[PDB]
């Protein structure tokens, strides 16, 4: 998985080389941001539930047709609502992982790769989740550097779906 650490060891390994002072400086810089990263990671875990329910609700309010169309894909059933909260839950989970790891490696591994084929075969628009993530980016409640750590990744997923 792409961490800063595995990235630096991978590069120095590909150059057939010991870890010089450069890569050790990089790992240092991972450690001296990691505290803000974990403060951001604990508050997201600390109120993950309400972020999900509020996110799905915001998606419903912006797109009123989703709760009204008589189709399997749309959240007009008792199933698409649960599955709607399921998917939003997945994204919030991955963001918390990337805040712990320190790069976008977990989201790029477990989530980003192959997502076009899912959203193409199951007729799901890119925006729905965009709207969800915009609500989470507006209402995570972090402050300062922890908020930069969260908004980086939450913006990043929006850059993926757009």
């Amino acid at each position: 998985m792409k961490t800063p650490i595995t990235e630096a060891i991978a590069s120095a390994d590909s150059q057939g080389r010991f870890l010089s002072n450069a890569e050790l400086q990089s790992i240092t810089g991972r450690y001296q941001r990691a505290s803000a990263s974990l403060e951001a990671a604990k508050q997201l875990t600390g109120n993950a539930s309400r972020l999900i329910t509020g996110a799905a609700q915001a998606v419903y309010t912006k797109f009123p047709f989703v709760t009204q169309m008589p189709g399997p894909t749309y959240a007009s059933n008792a199933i698409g609502k649960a599955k709607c909260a399921r998917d939003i839950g997945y994204y919030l989970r991955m963001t918390t992982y990337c805040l712990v790891v320190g790069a976008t490696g977990p989201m790029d591994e477990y989530l980003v790769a192959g997502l076009e084929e899912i959203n193409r075969s199951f007729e799901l628009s890119p925006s729905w989740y965009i709207a969800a993530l915009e609500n989470i980016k507006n209402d995570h409640g972090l402050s300062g550097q922890a908020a930069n750590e969260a908004n980086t990744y939450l913006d990043y997923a929006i850059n993926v779906l757009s």
Partner: protein, 227 residues
């Protein structure tokens, strides 16, 4: 069966020993199958090979090959066979082959697979004959089974641009996909030249009176800002 004619030979960078003990940078990442990479690093190899042949522009979803990926990830082929079956794939033929004037497709093959510029014009001549008779298949068979390609990439490595940047100097050589882009200078000439290109000239307008003349101080301004 009429072998390839004897051609000349030039002197480029790829035939010297830049010892470079302990590589600075610029050494294209060894994206292979030898290091037993997991799912991600496999995806990075797959993307790096795609960029290499197709390049960034032709790496779109329609162009992408699922099946040779699924075979490669599972060990059913070598990377060399992946690069080969890549070029034989027809989406590469509709774009980069049907456009290119036969001597020019020889550039992008000897140059996108071997990572070196052509030695002289005669090379383009001979290799364009063998792709003109045997078909694209046996030409790519010639380049891949060649002694050179086995000597430096072996069985599982994505081809790279060899010695693009000399030690210390920043400039070096222009990137490869930049160098031979696709369309070509004279390909259009035979058809209608691209119509309706005027508006870019309209959006940018300088009065003739504003234009610098010889001997003004302003012409040298750029030099002053670099010092």
């Amino acid at each position: 069966s009429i072998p390839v004619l004897n051609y000349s030979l030039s002197t480029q960078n790829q035939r010297v020993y830049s010892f470079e003990y302990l590589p600075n940078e610029e050494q294209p990442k060894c994206y292979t199958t030898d290091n037993l990479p997991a799912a991600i690093e496999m995806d990075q190899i797959i993307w790096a090979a795609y960029r290499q042949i197709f390049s960034e522009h032709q790496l779109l979803s329609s162009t992408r090959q699922p099946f040779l990926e699924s075979q490669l990830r599972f060990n059913q082929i070598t990377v060399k066979d992946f690069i080969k079956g890549l070029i034989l794939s027809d989406a590469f033929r509709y774009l980069n082959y049907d456009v290119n004037n036969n001597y020019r497709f020889v550039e992008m093959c000897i140059q996108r697979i071997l990572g070196r510029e052509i030695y002289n014009h005669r090379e383009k001549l001979a290799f364009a004959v063998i792709i003109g008779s045997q078909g694209l298949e046996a030409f790519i068979d010639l380049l891949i089974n060649s002694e050179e390609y086995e000597d430096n990439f072996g069985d599982n490595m994505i081809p790279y641009q060899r010695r693009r940047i000399i030690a210390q100097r920043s400039k070096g050589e222009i990137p490869f996909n930049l160098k031979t882009p696709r369309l070509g200078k004279d390909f259009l000439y035979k058809q209608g030249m691209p119509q309706l290109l005027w508006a870019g000239p309209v959006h940018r307008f300088r009065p003739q009176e504003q234009s610098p003349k010889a001997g003004d101080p302003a012409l040298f301004l750029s030099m002053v800002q670099d010092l």
